[PDB]
Amino acid sequence: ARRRRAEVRQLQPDLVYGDVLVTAFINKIMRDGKKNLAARIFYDACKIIQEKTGQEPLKVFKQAVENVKPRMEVRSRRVGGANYQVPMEVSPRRQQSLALRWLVQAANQRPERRAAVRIAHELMDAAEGKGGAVKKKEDVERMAEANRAYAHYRW
Amino acid sequence: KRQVASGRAYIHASYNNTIVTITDPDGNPITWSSGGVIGYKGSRKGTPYAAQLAALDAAKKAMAYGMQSVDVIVRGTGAGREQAIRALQASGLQVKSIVDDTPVPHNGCRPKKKFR
Amino acid sequence: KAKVKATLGEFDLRDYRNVEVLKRFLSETGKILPRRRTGLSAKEQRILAKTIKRARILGLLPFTEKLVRK
RNA sequence: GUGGGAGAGGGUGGUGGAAUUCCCGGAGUAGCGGUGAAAUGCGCAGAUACCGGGAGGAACGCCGAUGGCGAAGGCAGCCACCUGGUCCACCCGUGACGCUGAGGCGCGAAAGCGUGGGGAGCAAACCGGAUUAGAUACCCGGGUAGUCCACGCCCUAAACGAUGCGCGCUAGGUCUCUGGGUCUCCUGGGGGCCGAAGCUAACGCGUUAAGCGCGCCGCCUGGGGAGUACGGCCGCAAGGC
Ligand SMILES: [Mg+2]
Ligand SMILES: [Mg+2]
Ligand SMILES: [Mg+2]
Ligand SMILES: [Mg+2]
Ligand SMILES: [Mg+2]
Ligand SMILES: [Mg+2]
Ligand SMILES: [Mg+2]
Ligand SMILES: [Mg+2]
Ligand SMILES: [Mg+2]
Ligand SMILES: [Mg+2]
Ligand SMILES: [Mg+2]
Ligand SMILES: [Mg+2]
Ligand SMILES: [Mg+2]
Ligand SMILES: [Mg+2]
Ligand SMILES: [Mg+2]
Ligand SMILES: [Mg+2]
Ligand SMILES: [Mg+2]
Ligand SMILES: [Mg+2]
Ligand SMILES: [Mg+2]
Ligand SMILES: [Mg+2]
Ligand SMILES: [Mg+2]
Ligand SMILES: [Mg+2]
Ligand SMILES: [Mg+2]
Ligand SMILES: [Mg+2]
Ligand SMILES: [Mg+2]
Ligand SMILES: [Mg+2]
Ligand SMILES: [Mg+2]
Ligand SMILES: [Mg+2]
Ligand SMILES: [Mg+2]
Ligand SMILES: [Mg+2]
Ligand SMILES: [Mg+2]
Ligand SMILES: [Mg+2]
Ligand SMILES: [Mg+2]
Ligand SMILES: [Mg+2]
Ligand SMILES: [Mg+2]
Ligand SMILES: [Mg+2]
Ligand SMILES: [Mg+2]
Ligand SMILES: [Mg+2]
Ligand SMILES: [Mg+2]
Ligand SMILES: [Mg+2]
Ligand SMILES: [Mg+2]
Ligand SMILES: [Mg+2]
Ligand SMILES: [Mg+2]
């Protein structure tokens, strides 16, 4: 995007929860253009989280995404020869993309056999503050406050 | 062990380091910190962060002898010359005044080729 | 801003001893102000420079001061 | 001549504050320094950072300027003595006494040489650390000659306005330093910028000529060989003409 702002794609509301964040999550699950399979994964995982826990999967999905949102991250900047890992904030749009992608890439690193089991288990742990996804978030904010000595390079 | 509770704070800010000394009203020092006193070793000491943590390290060292009132004195241009001041104000030490006393010669001594 | 000669009286530019009026040509530091700030003429500033330096050696005007800011 | 004027013009003596370094004392811990990162270096015999006292040398911040002065080299704190140049007003005096100028003589940045001082900072050579394919370098830490003073040499230069000197003439506008005047301005003497006429191969110059003329000196005649060789004069030498 050299010319324009390259506006955001507006996702269609969830067919079930009427929620755009659901569809955006379903999309990150979808591979090879199978949205049908990706939904049946997500929705059959909504039954796992709502049976194995007496709580609404809507509020858990939200609560899990929130706990994985990084407030800061590290970027490179070419300065005086070799570059530097520079900490800076995260626009709230990027907090969305990272936390969502992190949930999904974590769940496939899980031991569980079937797809929806990994999702619901990762989600359940992520809202609780544990599980692989929250570690990527807690490790990123560790890059910042480590290279905090370069907070003057903000760019 | 002294109970001074009022005195001076000198910020020596160069491009390679920022270092902070705290004295009593007569000028004799009490405690001090620097970019190297805190863990930083190389070029990192002349950063605004190191400038901040150094100013605050000495500012807590002065709380031991009971410092409250602080008169700030500044020498040198440097990264984090201002950042050490801004740190010093928020240190809890009530900052009495700020003075820039950076020594300038009246063109007396031949500088190194680096400054020529 | 205002200029120094503008807000002043009829004074002796050659009198190194009158401090009350020569202090009005120094800055916050001891520096001698530029013509753009003193509103003096080419010949006058040259004469002021010498008279202030004279007063500096008698201990009446300062060589340099400390800036209370920043 | 007379009466006024501006100025880092020159020489001599004196003197003032800022900064660097070193020493003394006070206070105070674990590093400082330095770079693109670093390392050599310095630091527990206590540095860096801070306060005070002292010694010593060199250079003068602001004023400071596109400014001023000098024939050029060049001249910058302040004070005093010796001293040079120059400009204006009066229209007073001498009555062509003028211009240039081969030789000669004097001056001549920096560097370099000799004798004796001095030596804080900087710094060829050199001693190290880095970088690098290598580093005989740029970057970093050290450091001698020297830079400073006296006396005597050396005589070079992008010693530049790459424009020899003096005089007369040929639209103006505008900024400026400094005189005088009946002081929106006029009128001199400098320093800048636009531009008439004209010149120039062009860029450009244009009352501060590179224009129009006159007098006199210096110098040029394709590049390399070569500012070399020889000879001569000069120099202690390096080397110069
Ligand atoms: Mg450093
Ligand atoms: Mg310096
Ligand atoms: Mg400077
Ligand atoms: Mg500078
Ligand atoms: Mg310079
Ligand atoms: Mg006279
Ligand atoms: Mg003079
Ligand atoms: Mg000591
Ligand atoms: Mg050692
Ligand atoms: Mg000595
Ligand atoms: Mg200047
Ligand atoms: Mg002149
Ligand atoms: Mg010159
Ligand atoms: Mg005279
Ligand atoms: Mg007559
Ligand atoms: Mg007659
Ligand atoms: Mg001759
Ligand atoms: Mg000479
Ligand atoms: Mg010399
Ligand atoms: Mg000698
Ligand atoms: Mg040195
Ligand atoms: Mg060196
Ligand atoms: Mg190479
Ligand atoms: Mg030629
Ligand atoms: Mg020539
Ligand atoms: Mg003119
Ligand atoms: Mg007048
Ligand atoms: Mg003129
Ligand atoms: Mg024409
Ligand atoms: Mg012209
Ligand atoms: Mg004429
Ligand atoms: Mg002419
Ligand atoms: Mg010839
Ligand atoms: Mg050739
Ligand atoms: Mg030939
Ligand atoms: Mg050839
Ligand atoms: Mg030749
Ligand atoms: Mg030659
Ligand atoms: Mg012959
Ligand atoms: Mg010969
Ligand atoms: Mg001989
Ligand atoms: Mg030789
Ligand atoms: Mg030669």
Curated annotation (Swiss-Prot), chain A:
Quaternary structure and partners? Part of the 30S ribosomal subunit. Contacts proteins S9 and S11. Binds to the C-terminus of IF3 and to the C-terminus of Era.
Task: Please state which protein family the record places this protein in.
Answer: Belongs to the universal ribosomal protein uS7 family.
Q: Which HAMAP family match?
A: Ribosomal_uS7_B
Q: Which GO terms describe its biological process?
A: translation
Q: Which UniProt keywords apply?
A: Ribonucleoprotein, Ribosomal protein, RNA-binding, rRNA-binding, tRNA-binding
Give GO cellular component annotations, separated by semicolons: small ribosomal subunit
Q: What does this protein do?
A: One of the primary rRNA binding proteins, it binds directly to 3'-end of the 16S rRNA where it nucleates assembly of the head domain of the 30S subunit. Is located at the subunit interface close to the decoding center. Binds mRNA and the E site tRNA blocking its exit path in the ribosome. This blockage implies that this section of the ribosome must be able to move to release the deacetylated tRNA.
Q: How is this protein named in the record?
A: Small ribosomal subunit protein uS7
User: Can you tell which superkingdom this protein's organism belongs to?
Assistant: Bacteria
What Gene Ontology molecular-function terms does this entry list? Answer: rRNA binding; structural constituent of ribosome; tRNA binding
NCBIfam families in the cross-refs? rpsG_bact
The record, for PROSITE patterns, names:
RIBOSOMAL_S7 (PS00052)
Swiss-Prot record, chain B:
Q: Name one GO molecular function term.
A: structural constituent of ribosome
What keywords would UniProt list here?
Answer: Ribonucleoprotein, Ribosomal protein, RNA-binding, rRNA-binding
Give the span(s) annotated as Disordered. 99-116
Q: Name one GO biological process term.
A: translation
* Recorded GO CC terms: ribonucleoprotein complex; ribosome
Name the source's superkingdom: Bacteria
Q: A Pfam family matched by this chain, by name?
A: Ribosomal_S11
Compositional bias, Basic residues, is annotated for 109-116
- Give the matching NCBIfam families: PRK05309.1 (NF003698), uS11_bact (TIGR03632)
So what family is this one in? Belongs to the universal ribosomal protein uS11 family.
Relate the assembly described in the record: Part of the 30S ribosomal subunit. Interacts with proteins S7 and S18. Binds to the C-terminus of IF-3; however exactly how IF-3 interacts with the 30S subunit is unclear. May contact the C-terminus of Era.
Q: What is this protein called?
A: Small ribosomal subunit protein uS11
What organism does the record attribute this protein to? Answer: Thermus thermophilus (strain ATCC 27634 / DSM 579 / HB8)
Curated annotation (Swiss-Prot), chain C:
This protein's name? Small ribosomal subunit protein bS18
Q: Which GO terms describe its cellular component?
A: ribonucleoprotein complex; ribosome
- Quaternary organization: Part of the 30S ribosomal subunit. Forms a tight heterodimer with protein bS6, also interacts with protein uS11. Binds to the C-terminus of IF3 and to the central section of Era.
Please state which portion of the whole protein this structure contains, as first and last residue out of the total length.
19 to 88 of 88
Q: Which GO molecular function, any one, fits this protein according to its record?
A: structural constituent of ribosome
UniProt family annotation = Belongs to the bacterial ribosomal protein bS18 family.
Organism source for this protein? Answer: Thermus thermophilus (strain ATCC 27634 / DSM 579 / HB8)
**Purpose:** Located on the back of the platform of the 30S subunit where it stabilizes the close packing of several RNA helices of the 16S rRNA. Forms part of the Shine-Dalgarno cleft in the 70S ribosome, where it probably interacts with the Shine-Dalgarno helix.
- Entry superkingdom: Bacteria
Q: Which GO terms describe its biological process?
A: translation
Write the record's keywords in alphabetical order, separated by commas: Ribonucleoprotein, Ribosomal protein, RNA-binding, rRNA-binding
